[PDB]
Design a protein around this ligand. Structure first.
Ligand SMILES: Cc1cccc(O[C@@H]2CCN(C)C2=O)c1F
Ligand SMILES: [Cl-]
Ligand SMILES: [Zn+2]
Ligand SMILES: [Zn+2]
Length: 566
């Protein structure tokens, strides 16, 4: 305990020796209060005017306009039963071994870390890299870990954050998981890391082709808050596949920063509290993704074991049941992993049959309680892969006029237009705002070409922003100045392993839409008076934005669509 977190607490107290206090009215029951000190300080979502001027009909849709305006953390999950714990340990050992069969754990390097900083995700961290003083501090902490101690690895609430140095040490020990694609479908069988939103539909359709029952897509309630110390210890077992320095460095990150967290949090009552918890997820956005994918893969194999009647009770695992679990994993584990599509806390499972639906004892006792359903009510499965929710999307099967088959991503169009109308942070020039608009427009042309309103608005934004201006922000092929019909052909035809005939598409009229009623169901404004006026007069809205940016080189993309041809 304090033997691992002490120094960090001691260091902070010293830097604030003239404002320390052990407030006895602290609002913490599940987090351990250590003290506070004087603090004073706070980012609200701003509107992208380029996108908003070119999406006027949506100015009166509350679902869109309300997106731009604007408890579970202090909870405790019970220690699972012993049979649950044995199931998890056995499954986690086997999964780490399967993931490392065709992969080599290895350290990430300052050079890799630096290049990422010089390319985005001392003031800015891009300045600390050059200052060797920073790296001197890193080595200090680094040699501090090698002894099994930490002093500078404390999270700052507000998506917790850490000093760049601590981020590097986590990257040096665990970066290999994302950088070498451990949760790729090829290597994990259930994973989709790096697979792309033009690939998720095809994946779900392949899972659908397997013999079995319904497709289940149960979202967990506050997954980040339900990670047990048992899960963190099962995650740590990746170190068993490591060697030398790496093995000790990874062990330290798991022991000192994950399985023993120290966090600073603001409290208006403004006294910065210093709480400590050994449970829940408190790592990187990228390591969190991969460890979430891993623990979700483990939970879903165990839920599959329970449906298939591999174990009878979680209270205790018999020696015979252990051999049965191990034999099940060795005999059908890879096939069972291929039945799932997991992305961090998000999953779709096509189990052997619908006994899975009522198999809830292990899932509930692991703490992975389902959202918006009664703890013991059986799961509502899906009978059609095109209505399954995954990664905030559903997928449409769409037949091209030449009979070739596209599987396309889709979501409620209010959500897509609402997100494009928002810019994160401040100090945006007109040009930087125009180029963020252009990133949305190019994404829409690539992924959402099949929605009539988004193809039209994407053409309008690309016509309203200078042709040579560069778009600025798994697979983001819209982040380019290349012609969008050429990127469409590469993504949907040339590089698409589900498409046998590689004949390029010659124009945008050969690229199909959803049904008109399909379009409206998914939130299109086709058939509204406001939308017809918007379309008819689109060249006037384009001209308004062009007049604001000024006399630059612009290209007219509206003649790509049939109606705008003279
Ligand atoms: C381009 C276009 C313009 C106007 C109406 C349209 O379709 C109407 C409106 C919704 N719906 C199911 C229809 O049949 C349309 F597609
Ligand atoms: Cl139709
Ligand atoms: Zn440390
Ligand atoms: Zn849809």
């Amino acid at each position: 305990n304090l033997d691992i977190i002490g120094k960090r607490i001691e260091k902070i107290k010293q830097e604030h020796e003239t404002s320390w206090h052990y407030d006895q009215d602290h609002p913490y029951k599940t987090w351990a209060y250590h003290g506070s000190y004087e603090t004073k300080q706070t980012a609200s979502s701003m509107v992208n005017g380029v996108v908003r001027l070119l999406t006027k009909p949506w100015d009166i849709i509350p679902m869109v306009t309300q997106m731009a305006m604007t408890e579970k953390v202090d909870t405790r999950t019970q220690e699972p039963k012993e049979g649950t714990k044995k199931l998890m340990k056995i499954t986690a050992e086997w999964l780490w071994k399967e993931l490392g069969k065709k992969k080599t754990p290895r350290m990430c390097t300052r050079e890799e870390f630096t290049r990422k900083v010089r390319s985005n995700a001392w003031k800015s961290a891009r300045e600390a890299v050059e200052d060797s003083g920073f790296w001197e501090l890193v080595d200090k902490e680094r040699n501090l870990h090698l002894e099994g101690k930490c002093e500078t690895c404390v999270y700052n609430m507000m998506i917790w954050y850490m000093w760049l140095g601590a981020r590097f040490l986590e990257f040096e020990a665990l970066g290999f998981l994302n950088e070498d694609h451990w949760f790729s479908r090829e290597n994990s069988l259930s994973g989709v890391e790096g697979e792309g939103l033009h690939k998720l539909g095809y994946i779900l359709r392949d899972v659908s082709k397997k013999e079995g029952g319904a497709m289940y897509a149960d979202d967990t309630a506050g997954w980040d808050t339900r990670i047990t110390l048992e899960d963190l210890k099962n995650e740590e077992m990746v170190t068993n596949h490591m060697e030398g320095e790496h093995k000790k460095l990874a062990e330290a990150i798991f022991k000192l920063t994950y399985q023993n967290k120290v966090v600073r949090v603001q409290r208006p009552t403004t006294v910065m509290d210093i709480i400590s918890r050994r449970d829940q997820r408190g790592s990187g956005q990228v390591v969190t993704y991969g460890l979430n994918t891993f623990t979700n893969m483990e939970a879903q194999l165990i839920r599959q074991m329970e449906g298939e009647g591999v174990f009878k009770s979680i209270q205790h695992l018999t020696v015979t049941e252990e051999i049965a679990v191990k034999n099940w994993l060795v005999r059908v584990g890879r096939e069972r992993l291929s039945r799932m599509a997991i992305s961090g806390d998000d999953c779709v499972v096509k189990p052997l049959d619908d006994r899975f639906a009522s198999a809830l004892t292990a899932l509930n006792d692991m703490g992975k309680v389902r959202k918006d359903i009664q703890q013991w009510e059986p799961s509502r499965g899906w009978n059609d892969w095109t209505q399954v929710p995954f990664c905030s999307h559903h997928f449409h099967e769409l037949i091209m006029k030449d009979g070739r088959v596209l599987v396309v991503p889709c979501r409620n169009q209010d959500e897509l237009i609402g997100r494009a109308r928002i810019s994160q942070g401040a100090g945006w020039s007109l040009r930087e705002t125009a180029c963020l608009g252009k990133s949305y427009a190019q994404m829409w042309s690539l992924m959402y070409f099949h929605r009539r309103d988004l193809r039209l608005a994407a053409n309008a934004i690309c016509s309203a922003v200078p042709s040579h201006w560069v778009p600025t922000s798994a697979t983001h092929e819209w982040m380019t100045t290349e012609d969008m019909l050429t990127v469409w052909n590469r993504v949907w035809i040339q590089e698409n392993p589900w498409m046998e005939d590689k004949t390029p598409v010659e124009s945008w009229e050969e690229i199909p839409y959803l049904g008109k009623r399909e379009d409206q169901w998914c939130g299109s404004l086709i058939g509204l008076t406001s939308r017809a006026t918007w379309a008819k007069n689109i060249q006037t809205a384009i001209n308004q934005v062009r007049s604001l940016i000024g006399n630059e080189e612009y290209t007219d993309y509206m003649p790509s669509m049939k109606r705008f041809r003279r």
